[PDB]
Amino acid sequence: AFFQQQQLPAAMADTFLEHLCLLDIDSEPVAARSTSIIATIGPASRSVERLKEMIKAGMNIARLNFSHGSHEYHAESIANVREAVESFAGSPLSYRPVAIALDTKGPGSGPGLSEQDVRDLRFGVEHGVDIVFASFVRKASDVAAVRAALGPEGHGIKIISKIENHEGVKRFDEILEVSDGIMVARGDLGIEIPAEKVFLAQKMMIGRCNLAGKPVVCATQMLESMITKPRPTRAETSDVANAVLDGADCIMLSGETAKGNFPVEAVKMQHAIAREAEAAVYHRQLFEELRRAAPLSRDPTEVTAIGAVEAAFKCCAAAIIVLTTTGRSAQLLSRYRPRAAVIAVTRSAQAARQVHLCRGVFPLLYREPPEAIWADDVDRRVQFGIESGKLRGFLRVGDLVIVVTGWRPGSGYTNIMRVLSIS
Amino acid sequence: ELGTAFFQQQQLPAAMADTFLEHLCLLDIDSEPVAARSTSIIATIGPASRSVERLKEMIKAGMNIARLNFSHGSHEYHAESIANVREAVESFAGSPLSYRPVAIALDTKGPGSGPGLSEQDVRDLRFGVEHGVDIVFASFVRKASDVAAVRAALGPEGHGIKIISKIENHEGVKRFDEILEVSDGIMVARGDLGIEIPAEKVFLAQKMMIGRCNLAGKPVVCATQMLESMITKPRPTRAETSDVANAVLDGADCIMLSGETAKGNFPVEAVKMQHAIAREAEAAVYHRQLFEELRRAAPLSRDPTEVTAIGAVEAAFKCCAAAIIVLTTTGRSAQLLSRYRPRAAVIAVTRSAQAARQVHLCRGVFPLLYREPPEAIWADDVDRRVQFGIESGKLRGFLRVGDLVIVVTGWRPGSGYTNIMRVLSIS
Amino acid sequence: RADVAQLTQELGTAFFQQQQLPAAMADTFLEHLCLLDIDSEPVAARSTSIIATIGPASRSVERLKEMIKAGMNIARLNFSHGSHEYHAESIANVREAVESFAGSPLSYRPVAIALDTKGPGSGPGLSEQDVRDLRFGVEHGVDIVFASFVRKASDVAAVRAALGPEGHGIKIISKIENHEGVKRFDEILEVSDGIMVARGDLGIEIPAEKVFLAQKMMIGRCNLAGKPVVCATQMLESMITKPRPTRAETSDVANAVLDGADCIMLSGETAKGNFPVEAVKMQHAIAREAEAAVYHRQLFEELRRAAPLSRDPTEVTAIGAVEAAFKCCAAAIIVLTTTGRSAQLLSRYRPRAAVIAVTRSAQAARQVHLCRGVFPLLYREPPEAIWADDVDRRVQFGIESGKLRGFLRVGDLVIVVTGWRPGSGYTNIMRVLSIS
Amino acid sequence: GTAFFQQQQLPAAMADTFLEHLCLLDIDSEPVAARSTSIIATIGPASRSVERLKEMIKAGMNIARLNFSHGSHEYHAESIANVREAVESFAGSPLSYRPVAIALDTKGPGSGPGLSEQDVRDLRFGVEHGVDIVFASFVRKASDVAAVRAALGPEGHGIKIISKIENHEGVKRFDEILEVSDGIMVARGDLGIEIPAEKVFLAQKMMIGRCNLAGKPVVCATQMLESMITKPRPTRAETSDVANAVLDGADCIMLSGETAKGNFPVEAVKMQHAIAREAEAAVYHRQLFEELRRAAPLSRDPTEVTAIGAVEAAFKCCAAAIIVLTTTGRSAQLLSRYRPRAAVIAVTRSAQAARQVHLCRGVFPLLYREPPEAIWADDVDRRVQFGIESGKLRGFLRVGDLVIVVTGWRPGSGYTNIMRVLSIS
Ligand SMILES: O=S(=O)(c1ccc(O)c(O)c1)N1CCN(S(=O)(=O)c2ccc(N3CCCCC3)c3nonc23)CC1
Ligand SMILES: O=S(=O)(c1ccc(O)c(O)c1)N1CCN(S(=O)(=O)c2ccc(N3CCCCC3)c3nonc23)CC1
Ligand SMILES: O=P(O)(O)OC[C@H]1O[C@](O)(COP(=O)(O)O)[C@@H](O)[C@@H]1O
Ligand SMILES: O=P(O)(O)OC[C@H]1O[C@](O)(COP(=O)(O)O)[C@@H](O)[C@@H]1O
Ligand SMILES: O=P(O)(O)OC[C@H]1O[C@](O)(COP(=O)(O)O)[C@@H](O)[C@@H]1O
Ligand SMILES: O=P(O)(O)OC[C@H]1O[C@](O)(COP(=O)(O)O)[C@@H](O)[C@@H]1O
Ligand SMILES: O=C([O-])C(=O)[O-]
Ligand SMILES: O=C([O-])C(=O)[O-]
Ligand SMILES: O=C([O-])C(=O)[O-]
Ligand SMILES: O=C([O-])C(=O)[O-]
Ligand SMILES: [K+]
Ligand SMILES: [K+]
Ligand SMILES: [K+]
Ligand SMILES: [K+]
Ligand SMILES: [Mg+2]
Ligand SMILES: [Mg+2]
Ligand SMILES: [Mg+2]
Ligand SMILES: [Mg+2]
């Protein structure tokens, strides 16, 4: 029964053609949904009660579109999101962190960072946003300007550069090099370049981000018809599935959740499609290619990450449990696209929110009492991941897990991988 | 010899990549497609696309197959649609640069939950034979016996009509292998399939069926809601263009338009959009792995047509042949070349008007109907048809003097004897 | 180039010119051959063990010391010739030469002692002389038995029974010497610890032009099973009388290593020849060159694709450690082992990094010479009060010995493989350590 | 039939990985195909007898090597005459006649910087006596090849120059040497003295790989069956060396003292023949063809384009043979570079080209003696039928087999462009 579920016959195929031939509509997905859902907050999704339904449906990142609404409007949206998120904090083994992303208005006709963007970025730092989706990034200096406007207090905010025009596509490599990740902003991109070429830019950018090990978001009109209709079109479900098969870390909803009549249903639909698409991923070729393309490294976190993903595939590990302060150890595991869920146990609430940008990372916020012996504290965070995993359905007694830790406290010292039997 | 400009176009840097990941990384929005569009466009005929003048615009935009939906309209209504299509097609018989064969496909109403073929389908199928349709899109095919019933309804005079089985429910998906074995091809009928099975599972059924059809070397059509928003809007959504591109990258031989052309406000624009996306997607196909996998998966064969076809596709890739010119009576030799997905266009020269229309079901086949009177000496009749294919190729933009072409012929007249592959320099 | 650019900038272009590294990074086997370079010097320690047959030319304690320094890892006693008294003296001389270096772990070299049986002769089962010789082996503490003319699984069970309860730890390497042994190979390998491709008798039992097929098939199946395989007989035959081998002989040694053999053997070359030490030096020189020429990219990928999924944590840790070692060009994989099994499971994935196996078992230290790339270190310190400190001291012992022996340098990365509790069977930890 | 797929290591050939291919190698799987690696036998006191040479041709000798390091011009002229007499004794039966090449192996430069004066005299002797190939000793650079070419003069333009790589400089300057040479000999005797003995296998494997990539013949030479000079059976290292030279990709294997001065010249040839057939069946064509295909550059030459199409077609149907018409041997050489499992039966009217194509693995030359037919299409058909009739007589073909037929569109060399699939009747 285990080998009939999650497209395992198609996963064992020796060629991609045979993999497609073995895809089965009766093979049910078992693993947790890896691709994060970004939902744009607006009139249709602003209430605390509606936001609780969206968190339960699968929303991982709340997007604030600063093209519309005042600072007072967005502060209320943030407070409502935080209230809905913290309503589930009473059960720590099942609490789901939710990131808050600020999407900038953009430069418009201006040459650099607009004055409104400087004010909105400052607002973001003051309100503790986790991510910035920087509109119309055309070159590396645009990213440096966004970074500078965040100041010394916004050092930890992730900058996701939105590629929306020909210049952004042509200067992609220099933009990705200085950014934390990319958003394929298909709405403007589809007007700036011929509509029939957007798929080439999406597939290229996702590929280059996967190669770089940096998050990539597929955005705009994924389930457009769901703004007025309860069910999407056949092109829309195919688009969501293909963004996941392309290698996107995140999928987004704009009008579908901000102003549409079915915001919760749009989130449920993206969740349902993503789980199906993630099981249909051809890991045999994907891992081989990612593994071959990733350069040789003398960084112990990078070295441990490859060893752990290889070990997870060898035993069909249910999960890779990793201790992370900044999210980096979980991100380095995520770049190899393991089938095993990457359960990231962290004390940082911000890192827990931000790792939703990395596919297959399931953040757990550690709020249990400290142990006096560092080694004892480490084993406690590990047993915590195992209890949250059992509660959420990721793990069962008898499963094997790969545990990734470091040799001393503080970020940057991950160097250990262990094979553990559950219970 | 070819120049650096040649190797910058049609995603050639991405095509030479050693891995699929590197292939994606090398895809370039500035790399323009050069080759002719190889995925056929099926357009549904209705009130928005019925007039002779509108049909001429649709043929110019790229329509290769006209679909008659027998779920609506009388026999008199469909006969008029057929006559209007034929009039619009024959209006280009003058200029060889613009003349193009257009297939006529009859889409059946269906069993509507009843045993065997419905009485209306028996009558509509008989209408199709009497009006000389080329293809039948058989609705709600659930098992092999459904195909045999459609085949028996094509009566004594319609055995040459191609049966494309529409897979629209769970049973059709589960019994796919037995259905494909007795069918000429398949249509992934996503509209009903999306209601019959969970909407989030349709992509698995589409990708599986396209894969199995590619492995079998039989045509597969991707259908329904590809550019749905274009029924009321002049431009499609980002999901819609992505869907068209992904159906081509999946391996579909044909893409379809339904309400977009039958009843919408922009039928010609919907055809133009599918044409534009398909050309872009066909250049982005990763032929290196696709050919290797089709080669490895295809069983060994002692059929000389199958053996010649793989030799010719290999020869075309080796020299970047501008085209593979094949002589075919039934379309079979062109279909066997098409199954290996050559980048080179397959120019199929035939005396059969029906085979010329039907080969639009096979990706990359460009049919040329040959009407010259036969030569007393057979080898001369063959050379005249090879030169007809070269001159139409030169006229249409495929070929130039100095290009290399692969020519596929047989050792004796009649169907079933293809066994020769020649490398020719265009003079 | 982009997959090695930062590491090339860090380690230098000279590092990537040595040990056939340009040929190792090739994307195809054809390109790998095209990039093989006679100027690319081997850097790694020799990983294929040399088995030298002991005889009149290699019996003195002084000669045996020169053979240990030349590279002999396993001493073979051919029980087809000589009395029990003769073999006991050979064993004592080997042990005396081996223990003459036991003053420091960075100079000590464990040497296994293998007993090669006379065989069944015309008989259907175990001979009475073999029963006596096998009991002699147990009484004299031999590490391995090379069982002659193994034709089926019951032959190996008979050898195992004749070793008795005290010889349970002795490794049985079945010699395949005829058509029946080749046809029943799978059942023989299943019950044996390893195989010897006994080419001398095999070349008489089957057509001489078919021996290479049997050698390549058996080596492949042993590599797939993760069990040791020895290539034997006439590898450097002409060196019995000549100081230099023929062009076919050096090619044979290189090709046995490229085929995947864990061990290579010398018979008359060391037992009776005029150049026993030179024959060992020649096999050492060829094996080092051939090991660097191995196409690890395809070999590792194929060992992973062929190896079935495993729920054994030792097996899971071993593949993770080998993957980590390739990622950083680790100088070594240091493993703690009681029976040698954790080191054997690392060895089956054919890492380029040396597997330094730290053990308290003197017998396991001798027996792991059967596994390609395993460098045994015998730990002699008494156990620490805290188990977690005892483990750490053993790892530091492997690092300090590795530094003093040239395997490791300051700045190198090493992969360390340990377990969660004492006793055999609990390896489950892999650590990436920087050498300071 | 099931029996067909049990022979010639077909289970091992269908394997998905090289490791599984090795695991499936079967000593009971008998080779069926004709031996495709040519055997070069060195002529000497043990192999000059016209009667002994007839036995060596029957055993499998394809190329007779004259070592100009020993013997006078008078001695070598007699060698040539004896070889030609033994070869032409079988000309009475054209369907089974085997052409045999004559190769002149030069003495070399010695302490000199360039072409020695003795080599100039020996080279002119070769042109005057109609040798087919020159094995040029101690080639260190491209100018050495140009000097050998110049010493052959205007009448020796058709002679093939195989450069012998015997030292470190030849290995370092390999690419420039191969570019101007027709092929290479891995001259292991001197190479094993010039560089460390333990490095020769790296130079052999590299050179064979580069020659295979270039589509040019490569010869593995020296001490392959050395012990057979005095013993009736070779050592285990010797049979392994022959098998591994074939698995490496060598087009030719050589015998020196084994046939020139030993006591078992015919048995040494029979042993190389037996080992080569076994090793050729054990070749992992799945990866080999894929890699040769991927590495070979795109081509606009119709002979090259036809050759790859014909090799692909031959693999698709398990063709027993690829029958090619060739004037210079080039069309057959271009088929050979893709290492088809199907025998390449080359029909030619050029006696020299028939002898020289023995340098290309898997090329079986047939000398066609009939004067041209008036109708060119009938002349082409008669040659193809001669290849079929020869192939049936020699065991290459049977009724029911499929064969790939490679021809051109007009007479003369350089116009091959047609591939056809033919059923044997
Ligand atoms: O060559 S294909 O286009 C073909 C399509 C139809 C066929 O029937 C077929 O045989 C051949 N094919 C396309 C799908 N992929 S895939 O395995 O799904 C895959 C998909 C995506 C990959 N990354 C790397 C690039 C960034 C995103 C993640 C991958 N990395 O490695 N493999 C990958 C195989 C290759
Ligand atoms: O990767 S390997 O070293 C390995 C893999 C797992 C093993 O278990 C093993 O022992 C070793 N391996 C070594 C043998 N070859 S091979 O298939 O015999 C072969 C042999 C030779 C090839 N050319 C290129 C060089 C000139 C001659 C033709 C070839 N081109 O493509 N394949 C080729 C596969 C690759
Ligand atoms: O992924 P990051 O940010 O580098 O954090 C990983 C760090 O977490 C740990 O596992 C635990 O460290 P702390 O006890 O400081 O939380 C470290 O050993 C390791 O360096
Ligand atoms: O693709 P099909 O239907 O088998 O037709 C291919 C046939 O066409 C030809 O090339 C030409 O035949 P005709 O002269 O009868 O048209 C035949 O030699 C070959 O058998
Ligand atoms: O390779 P083996 O034979 O399983 O031995 C590995 C064992 O060695 C250890 O690393 C150390 O164990 P000891 O304290 O008994 O020496 C164990 O944790 C592990 O189980
Ligand atoms: O391999 P080569 O030397 O190019 O010779 C091939 C030539 O042989 C032929 O097949 C037959 O030519 P001939 O009639 O002159 O022998 C030509 O059509 C072709 O050009
Ligand atoms: O800004 C965006 O999100 C877009 O343009 O798609
Ligand atoms: O009938 C159709 O075309 C469908 O259901 O999509
Ligand atoms: O016994 C042996 O070692 C042999 O026969 O090779
Ligand atoms: O010259 C040769 O043949 C050699 O040196 O091997
Ligand atoms: K915005
Ligand atoms: K219908
Ligand atoms: K013995
Ligand atoms: K010479
Ligand atoms: Mg925008
Ligand atoms: Mg329908
Ligand atoms: Mg023996
Ligand atoms: Mg020499």
PDB file of C-alpha atoms in Angstrom, chain A residues 157-218:
ATOM      1  CA  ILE A 157      13.999  41.205   6.195  1.00  0.00           C
ATOM      2  CA  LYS A 158      14.130  39.030   3.041  1.00  0.00           C
ATOM      3  CA  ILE A 159      14.150  40.866  -0.303  1.00  0.00           C
ATOM      4  CA  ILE A 160      12.361  39.007  -3.097  1.00  0.00           C
ATOM      5  CA  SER A 161      12.940  40.852  -6.377  1.00  0.00           C
ATOM      6  CA  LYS A 162       9.938  40.961  -8.710  1.00  0.00           C
ATOM      7  CA  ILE A 163      10.970  40.533 -12.379  1.00  0.00           C
ATOM      8  CA  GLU A 164       8.316  42.372 -14.405  1.00  0.00           C
ATOM      9  CA  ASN A 165       9.963  43.605 -17.622  1.00  0.00           C
ATOM     10  CA  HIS A 166      12.535  42.882 -20.366  1.00  0.00           C
ATOM     11  CA  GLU A 167      15.377  44.582 -18.435  1.00  0.00           C
ATOM     12  CA  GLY A 168      14.762  42.512 -15.318  1.00  0.00           C
ATOM     13  CA  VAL A 169      14.871  39.323 -17.450  1.00  0.00           C
ATOM     14  CA  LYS A 170      18.081  40.384 -19.253  1.00  0.00           C
ATOM     15  CA  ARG A 171      19.812  41.457 -16.038  1.00  0.00           C
ATOM     16  CA  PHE A 172      18.397  38.450 -14.077  1.00  0.00           C
ATOM     17  CA  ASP A 173      21.771  37.003 -13.004  1.00  0.00           C
ATOM     18  CA  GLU A 174      22.951  40.257 -11.363  1.00  0.00           C
ATOM     19  CA  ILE A 175      19.560  40.715  -9.651  1.00  0.00           C
ATOM     20  CA  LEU A 176      19.435  37.154  -8.237  1.00  0.00           C
ATOM     21  CA  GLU A 177      23.036  37.476  -6.977  1.00  0.00           C
ATOM     22  CA  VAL A 178      22.103  40.340  -4.619  1.00  0.00           C
ATOM     23  CA  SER A 179      18.506  39.252  -3.818  1.00  0.00           C
ATOM     24  CA  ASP A 180      17.229  36.641  -1.357  1.00  0.00           C
ATOM     25  CA  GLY A 181      14.848  35.296  -4.044  1.00  0.00           C
ATOM     26  CA  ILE A 182      12.713  36.136  -7.071  1.00  0.00           C
ATOM     27  CA  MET A 183       9.070  36.587  -7.990  1.00  0.00           C
ATOM     28  CA  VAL A 184       8.005  35.859 -11.595  1.00  0.00           C
ATOM     29  CA  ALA A 185       5.516  38.772 -11.704  1.00  0.00           C
ATOM     30  CA  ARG A 186       3.579  37.527 -14.753  1.00  0.00           C
ATOM     31  CA  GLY A 187       0.947  40.313 -14.831  1.00  0.00           C
ATOM     32  CA  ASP A 188       3.299  43.151 -15.766  1.00  0.00           C
ATOM     33  CA  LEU A 189       5.746  40.766 -17.462  1.00  0.00           C
ATOM     34  CA  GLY A 190       2.907  39.673 -19.809  1.00  0.00           C
ATOM     35  CA  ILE A 191       2.393  43.328 -20.884  1.00  0.00           C
ATOM     36  CA  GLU A 192       6.134  44.263 -20.984  1.00  0.00           C
ATOM     37  CA  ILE A 193       7.107  41.291 -23.204  1.00  0.00           C
ATOM     38  CA  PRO A 194       4.906  39.268 -25.675  1.00  0.00           C
ATOM     39  CA  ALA A 195       2.342  37.152 -23.760  1.00  0.00           C
ATOM     40  CA  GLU A 196       3.479  33.994 -25.617  1.00  0.00           C
ATOM     41  CA  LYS A 197       7.022  34.421 -24.178  1.00  0.00           C
ATOM     42  CA  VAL A 198       6.144  34.639 -20.431  1.00  0.00           C
ATOM     43  CA  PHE A 199       6.405  30.828 -19.995  1.00  0.00           C
ATOM     44  CA  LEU A 200      10.019  30.953 -21.252  1.00  0.00           C
ATOM     45  CA  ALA A 201      10.911  33.649 -18.690  1.00  0.00           C
ATOM     46  CA  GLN A 202       9.087  31.739 -15.897  1.00  0.00           C
ATOM     47  CA  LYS A 203      10.780  28.410 -16.684  1.00  0.00           C
ATOM     48  CA  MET A 204      14.230  30.032 -17.067  1.00  0.00           C
ATOM     49  CA  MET A 205      13.942  32.046 -13.818  1.00  0.00           C
ATOM     50  CA  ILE A 206      12.668  29.065 -11.815  1.00  0.00           C
ATOM     51  CA  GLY A 207      15.551  26.960 -13.198  1.00  0.00           C
ATOM     52  CA  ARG A 208      18.188  29.573 -12.349  1.00  0.00           C
ATOM     53  CA  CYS A 209      16.746  30.072  -8.829  1.00  0.00           C
ATOM     54  CA  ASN A 210      16.711  26.284  -8.258  1.00  0.00           C
ATOM     55  CA  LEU A 211      20.367  26.163  -9.435  1.00  0.00           C
ATOM     56  CA  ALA A 212      21.233  29.034  -7.035  1.00  0.00           C
ATOM     57  CA  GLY A 213      19.284  27.455  -4.137  1.00  0.00           C
ATOM     58  CA  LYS A 214      17.227  30.660  -3.703  1.00  0.00           C
ATOM     59  CA  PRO A 215      13.416  30.884  -3.384  1.00  0.00           C
ATOM     60  CA  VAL A 216      11.287  31.553  -6.476  1.00  0.00           C
ATOM     61  CA  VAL A 217       7.591  32.562  -6.464  1.00  0.00           C
ATOM     62  CA  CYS A 218       5.204  32.027  -9.374  1.00  0.00           C
TER      63      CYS A 218
END
